[model samples]
Target: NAMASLHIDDIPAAIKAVKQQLRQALPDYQQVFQAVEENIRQQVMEIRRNLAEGKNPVPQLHADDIINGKVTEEQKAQIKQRGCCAILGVFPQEKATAWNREIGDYLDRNNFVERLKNAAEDNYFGTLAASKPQIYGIYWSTPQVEARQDKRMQAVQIFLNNLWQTESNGKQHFDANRVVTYADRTRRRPPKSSSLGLSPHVDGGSIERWLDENFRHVYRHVFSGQWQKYDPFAAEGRPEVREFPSPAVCSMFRTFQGWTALTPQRTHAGTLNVIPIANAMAYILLRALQDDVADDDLCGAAPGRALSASEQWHPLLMEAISPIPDLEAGDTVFWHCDVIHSVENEHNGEFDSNVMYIAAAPWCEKNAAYLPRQLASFIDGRSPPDFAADDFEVDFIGRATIKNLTEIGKQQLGIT
Candidate 1:
């Protein structure tokens, strides 16, 4: 999956800007971050203990992970150098099972191209095909929109919220739009042909992330030349970086991306892959903003042209970097914007493996502002901001509602 990049020469300035943004967005970030780190270490230990003794799992909170340094030095270093890292056996057994059941029920209750039941469905990957939104093509017709029809989407949403809502201690809230799964065929390969899986791609408005005001702000570090300062979890970088424009936005990174496990699973059992290196990934995407690969030889051609000092090639950037090493039932993976990655499609078991499409996006002003339009689509069963307008249909059996969410979930869903 190749993500476009944005380049800026002022690295020092970018770093300074990122620092200022963090200071402003989080007045007590220093204290909060330290606490978060300790919490993550404790949680990890707890999980390790539980798993060793054969217990199910709890979800990892990104908001907490960022503050607490739950991420290892090795993980962070690899993410910096290669653009990704993987956290193995991150979830407990039972939690993963429950999520899969919810997804299965959502699918079984639906009509037409539900990812599980009906196998011949189509998705609206957005109209501007050149640059597509993330998961934007599933929808229901106007006639299909009604209170009774919202449960499935609502269940999926609540299921996702439970995975993300953690640490009610900080003044944190969750505000996000739901991306309902309306499919005729699977996004995955032959066995089921119902999954309708997606290839590697960066979401939202594709290259337009560089074009949009809010999108650009998502990676303020790149524009300021302080690429290393980009923080995926911090709120400062997001205020200006709103969701993509309609249809496309509905189809792209409106809230966050997520998945749940159905059976006893592992990374190779169709897990989401990622690059742990945030800095390198950002740099690569930023580089995509440039005209072309620095030199033909950069990707392995003749080295005839003179290379500039700043034009050196990053071999790691040009490689197929896998950030997530493995996963289990109940475990989830949340990636940063434009973290080039893909889902594993090789499922060989007797059981039809299942996972839900959920993401981890906290509710902040930016998300609150974006939720209504997305909500409209969720209710109407159509594409959202980042997707395309299509005749995609949902069986309309169940409706996903805000009430299904927890207090934290309500915050993320922008209840007020």
Candidate 2:
């Protein structure tokens, strides 16, 4: 079960090419890049230390340990404060890689990859109505809605609880119970135009991030024009209040978006790019619609400048973390929810870097509310509410039950 390791020296030229492109894309960002990379490296060392002591380094609150509950007073306050929280090394490398490989093989054979590509062709989010039942919700749920709901909840509970047992934070909260699995896979987009993805927008339910008087306080610095004073990692803004069983309109921000590596991945291998400081990214993104960036521009300026004097100088917030010069099996990358980022489609390997697109979406009222719709779509093989409809049948296959799930898979599809 020892996962594969990516030697930094194996792909020096590829690494060099990636760095050069990144540097061109983000001029004068060497300092910020180093800072973020070193910090993550330090965090990895801490995880090593915790393991040596038989201690869990993750922070947990009471809500995380519970099943189907509202955010406690303390957790509600924290979520309102910080847009997200970081959970380090929630799962070990071998386990993550195994899941990635299993999921990858399943997806490829079923042609889910082609279906996804097709969905991407027509814009994955807005075209939900046009998706094939299988590509849309096929492999996700079962028929008996109540039964499926129960099963899904149970699966989430069991798997997540197993993972959550390692929590180091004193107060457990519902967020800690969100079991996100990262599976690796490959992706490609032809030149002339790339895939149409999200713009620089914050996740939904953000109004809650600004509504809860406590949550509103998390962005006090940004509102005050002293954007430079914000520290995204401060424990104050976290486990924010989210509308439980929220309506379709509610799009809440996830605490930390992350994934585990299933294969050896490098920058051009479509590795993740992240903004080191999320607060900065948040502030910058909110105003992106107004910024008229030229195709040749890198970014404006750090901390931001006035629209007139420093309009052209955008900040350097995003960068690639060459963990050991490349990402290998078992490595997990966690980014603050507010980080403005995207994935690249370049890779030298013939095979895909296949990955599972999982995020730490805890049991907020909003996320919980959306579960039913998700379950329904899974049952029909239709699109989820947040994504577009897909034509999976055109060149793909789909499954209906967890019985169809892998050996270690649990059936949560709409019925218990």
Candidate 3:
């Protein structure tokens, strides 16, 4: 099915061309590929055993430790190893609960859900659910604004940004200490709702990881067979990654993709799943070049879609998929930008599971360029520029105003 759609006669040649170039660049390519292949197999088996024993693969940390910069070297090492962690107590439980209630009230007050029922729109909401909504397209709610501009939230983003090596040659690629607000949507899934079956995938880019020059530079170490030296946190070349223009894709670089929970959630309760190996990119990229990997397109990916991994295409990754453990409201979950992540399929809990999608978008040249446009959207109560242009909240009451923004929020959005 994947190959039937290809009309570009040069894509086959392009794949071979990139493969040959990589092989030429890396003298021990075959040896490195074999070792990574074996490592993945071992990891998959171990993860399977852990899951069978009812153990969680994702780790946790305290938000106080992060905000106060008290995380130990050992803890940092573990988080780097897993490439994801839940920061507990990011907000007061009461505050999170109140925010959740406020969001619900806002939705009801504006007849948001009822409005969606009558309108047929091509947006994130449409793809996630058409009948019974799970994810929403709305982005400019007051609660969302408050959460993003919260001092603690800014601290969390700074902590995440600092995890990366943002400086090179005495120049900083992005300001790790400063966080820019990237507006995102919310997820509210009621128990007993049908599963969206989001599957194991990585967001950001699909084939653009190879097709985009800057993106390729970000993965140069992997393609060059120096996967051990690959720094997932390195900021060089990342700010320049321009995903093919699409509503579904993120434009600027995000050091860590993250979210803050507004409702208590547990494994199998529509939480998150991740393949926690940060170094898995080497294997995934090399695997794409194999002659046996004749599936869809070159790199077996498409623009505007999450890069998917299945038992057939990426068996090891599928086997290693692990769900995050129990989380209370106020806990924040963050994963490396390159991590393969997904939302769990079902919501088997007794109550709703909810979260606000936010990320560690630090200030960089590219991000600075995006701020003006984001400011315009925020001012007009429209969806962020990267998302679908659904100005549904322009006239909605209780929506956030510029006065609601904190000083840092004002600066991040280029409003002040």
Candidate 4:
């Protein structure tokens, strides 16, 4: 089980087989791919011009709209089109600030940084092109649990989940209102650091998109040459996907991958950047099927790494990248599952940018199945099952216990 063995050596044969089958299924695949490419190029050109003109296109709204279940259909439409949005003020500014301070105290009390040298466990960042002492692999922190279980969080998740077409193919994909916690690491990037920034990439899986049966079905329209009909927000077949296990694999099917801010973050402050287009995935999927690409290649996608976007492969998307707007503490950013996102290469600001990687994992077979086991990890102060056995919290002082969980937190963790 530890190996997540990759069977990586088998990737070439796998790609070859899948590639032929796909070509057979879509005889006019090249024409379809070209059309999609042209459309994407136009959109990317407009987006880049929009960015250069200093236009801010990332959709943003207050958490109160979601909390009160009043997020308008107009706002929803824009968010759906853009595939990313910022939820303002899930917590009061002072409250989020205090939580950061408390978290600092918790880390100090545990001497977390010094002990980090004692063990090296795999994490999401392990597969990235760059490295920074950014992510704190701690899970079970009070602020994190508090955030995941809050009423605002639940409402925001429901709003995001509702954007998806949850019922299709005579199956109910997931319950938008009922959610479960997917424990992840927090990040605290410090000031004025020159860093090798992360490149544009999409998480969840790389080659698995074409090779995994569930994923192929999820993007059935694209592979079947109906690229225009492909719905990125279709919830069906998503919970059924099983990514080839790796440190980079996120086991939970997040409705919207997100992070909550704990400090004021400005554009170019080592902050997040994204392409802001949702259906652009059709471009990536179809481009890989072109005759120009070799049999064993899916545009530089590997067996287990993040699906990369570079000038060599996804230049239009990379060229259209835009950073999120200035954010105050307590705001959260969420993006559709397929959005291409990256971080600024360097921190040009004088202050730190801290955030906790939280996301909306609605209740479904795959997500619900993960809870009790994840709860076990919480009880033991071990890293969540999806992450490595860092075990840093096993005896770390100030670690939260089950008794510290609120009623909603207990419910999210699968405790009666």
Candidate 5:
């Protein structure tokens, strides 16, 4: 876990190492590269046509399907193909709205507005081309904690976790039936905001995709010219991935990066968009290894930022960018960890875009291990270990404490 704590002190040195190691480890990458590139070029054309004709690739499922085991095989197939889904009505609209109001009161009561200027520059959100509103780096608030442990949210997380190939490679990769919480931040954007939310990028790890040993083995099929055999949902190599040590690199693997809507968000009104072809991860990898990059990290791959996707390097994939279906408060949207996604820069909606970030972090050794400190952080009002140690809530008036946790909340925070 300290791998994420081990910050990179030498940028130029790391880039040079990428050049040397990649040249040595992947001498046959040319043939491997060309095969996948050809495949992506064809996919690009097909996906563009689909997008031009108004096809929406993001899937939407209902809470009833998850709770009642009603997800049909056909539905699962579509969700699996797209690698993202919106699970609607996980919370009641009234309850979600009430929580949003409580969050506002909590921040106001704690004088968070005055402290906002003193807030540590702990995240890359500040690095975006657009300016940011306080996305609330405070992760220990009552609403976020309560939402994560809610039975409905837990059920949805289990359903999402089960989508992966948990038993592939003749082994159990993670406990799909159980989940532990990964304390993530909340976003409360105001109406008519002019900032571009975020750009298209993949998270978890950027350059480490090609450099880390586990990543190389996990993506061996992609690197071996057998990319057609690559399985993005396979869970085997995921639990073991050690992202290159950086504050920006997520320390734990989430089956899906998700958010629970606390306010209604319109389809294209400055909400999320994802390039839905999960297999296109194959394209990103192969495209990077090609002569276009020539030893440089692909698409500006660097130490601290998410692996950004751009028109220059991945025009084909970008051509098919799709938005989540209109979401109401109480709905939740999720995307596979490797899916390329971004937030639309400007908020054009009448209502504020509000969401409490949570993700399906299935119970695995890595996730389970993270909870000890996560729980400690909850008790002490420290930020989660995965995030910058701002400890903004340590003395905040209304931050959640141990007494606030429900039985299931305790379990999710790794209480035995």
Candidate 6:
């Protein structure tokens, strides 16, 4: 809202200040920018055709294929280019279904929704509409804990994280090969739910992408007028970007934001939609630096809001938006951190569209630092730092505890 409240007269000055510094950093800004724009145009054209053809532009791989090294070089290249993929058979379908039912039972048994009403403040749990509560705030459910610590799940994360690259400095900033437990939430959207689908946006950080000093290093290639050299997978200065103290801020450098399906969901059934192009970040930055946009507008972005993409500002990208292929229980989906993605607004399917939000939060100093607090929350049955402080599940039955955690879980929690 701060960005939206800025006076029209002040926006140009702000843009000019940032742009001038960028030009100073890169003398050949215009030429490099043109090349980037041309690349976006070409990719967008191809994606548009794919969308028109009802094609699944995002790549696909099986968990066994990833674990067995059966994923071919061409498939790997496609995943890097598309920036998203679906991994089938991460867990047994029956197991995923059983977990979904158990989650429902846990919520019902605890009077989870009623506790929010009993609380004085509006917590994340309070946001659920009573009629059809699609999202649950219970993060420490037994199923979620087990899923996060499961060996196969960790292996999937390793594969996704390995897609990223470390710089040639011979110093590892973060270990993509190792898993870190970043606790997230679950969603259970009922059929025919009111759909005000999420718009196209990127999360993690908003203006901090340009304003934060360490974050600027992640986009140094873009600022240096050599955006083509910019690798979205490069682990350059990402760990140095401090986690903003807000629920909206992600503290860990998750190379791939991901989720595991707990119920079958088909296209347009409130499934995820993604632009699937890593290079779209370049377009967004270039657009933000332009002076033509209204001063009060940050290209449909605000400090805490998802950095939105629109036809007006991001025409080509909007045209290329595609829904993920149909997914079944036990499947997982992942997209690069920089990808522009959204949830479908409607669920026309007959059953609930359910998923558990997990991500490839690999081991890093920052993530390790955050884990102690997450570990405390897991033990006490409280919400983690990224969520609202409503201790609704503290006394709930069947809540996950340290005893339920395995040795792998202990390591993920940074325990000795």
Q: Judged by TM-score, which candidate is best?
A: 4
How far residue 349's Cα lies from its native spot in candidate 2, in Å, is 3.8
- Scored by Cα lDDT, where does model 2 land? 0.39
Best by lDDT: 4
Evaluated at residue 128, the lDDT of candidate 1 is 30
TM-score of every model versus the real structure: 0.51, 0.48, 0.91, 0.94, 0.90, 0.91
lDDT of 4 by residue, 1-416 (tens): 21244487888888898899999999899899888888787878777777788876788989997777677889888898789999998888998998888778888799777677544446655434224467788997888878888888888888889899999878889988787889998988888776564589888888888888888889999888777788888998988776777788777889899989999978878889889888888889888988889998899898657988888977777778889877889989999989998888878788888998989888888887888889899989999888878788899777888777788888877896
lDDT of each: 0.40, 0.39, 0.79, 0.83, 0.80, 0.80
Residue pairs with backbone overlap in model 3:
2-296
- The predictions' CA RMSDs to the true structure, in order, are 12.1, 14.8, 3.7, 3.1, 3.3, 3.5
Worst 10 residues of 4 by lDDT: 124-133
**Candidate 2 positional error at 361, Å:** 1.2
Better of 2 and 5 by TM-score: 5
Which digits, one per residue and each the tens of the lDDT, describe model 5 over residues 22-49?
6566777778767776776675676567
Candidate 6, superposed: residue stretches over 4 Å from native: 1-16, 23-31, 120-132, 294-297
Of the two candidates 2 and 4, the one with more favorable TM-score, higher being better, is 4
Model 1: CA > 4 A from native:
1-92, 95-99, 114-199, 209-237, 242-246, 250-256, 285-315, 318-320, 374-395, 398-411
User: What lDDT, from 0 to 1, does candidate 4 have?
Assistant: 0.83
* Better lDDT candidate (3, 5): 5
Clashes, model 6: 1
Write the residue-wise lDDT of candidate 3 on 273-375 in tens digits: 8998776776777777655655344456665577777777787787788887678898889998888988887788989999999888998887888888888
lDDT of 6 by residue, 1-416 (tens): 34335454554465556656765776665567678889988887887787788778888899999888899889988899889999999998999999989998998899977775666346554454443456678899989988999898898889888777854588787887889988888988777777554589888776666655677788888887778798888887887864334568876778888889999878868788899898789878767655575544457655566678888888878878888878899899999988999888878888888899988898888888899888788878888887888777889999988887899998988775
